[PDB]
């Protein structure tokens, strides 16, 4: 499984 996170962590 791959990491995910809250959207404020990525410019997209």
């Amino acid at each position: 499984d791959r990491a995910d996170g809250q959207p404020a962590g990525d410019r997209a």
Partner: antibody
Amino acid sequence: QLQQSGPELVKPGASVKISCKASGYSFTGYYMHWVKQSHVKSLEWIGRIDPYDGATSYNQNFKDKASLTVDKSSTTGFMELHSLTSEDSAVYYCAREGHWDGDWYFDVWGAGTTVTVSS
Amino acid sequence: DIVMTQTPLSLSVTIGQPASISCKSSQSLLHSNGKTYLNWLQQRPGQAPKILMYLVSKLDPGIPDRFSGSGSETDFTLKISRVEAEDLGVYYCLQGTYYPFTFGSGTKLEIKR
């Protein structure tokens, strides 16, 4: 969970690399983020790294100040700060963005590394 | 970047009385995907910050039920139903909707005795 390296005394203009050793979970399944605490009530998010492929994302305020890397073999994350000034003296935290029941949030933190920039 | 404004910046409460902290964001924290990424954190003296709740009001397991959050869009409130001695410290709101993550300036909670 997360074990950060010890306090640092750094000269102005030099650089410093601090580390965060992860244990007891799947290192490559979770983002590692870094946070700056400059005063008693000031927190700034620096950026994050995906330990699986090393992909990074920076707060624009830190894109030149900080460089994030990982070492997959030793399940350790690193933040290097470049060209330090007194404004870089602070406590720096690493945190894991874990997930509970489909949602993600900072669920594990290291105890902090104190960096003192000084001649 | 989203500006997070907390109210008040310091407050003192008697053990057993309620406490409330307000957070206002410069833009609605409602993401296009439906979720509202508002987080509340507590920092005790000498320790790292710790998540209390995420998505406005969802408590991290192991956080006592006396903590609760509410609000929507641009206005959010953290409440402690009955303050305990161990609740002293600094409280932060954190928005995770708009890159980059931004915290508010912390609110310091002191105990009256």
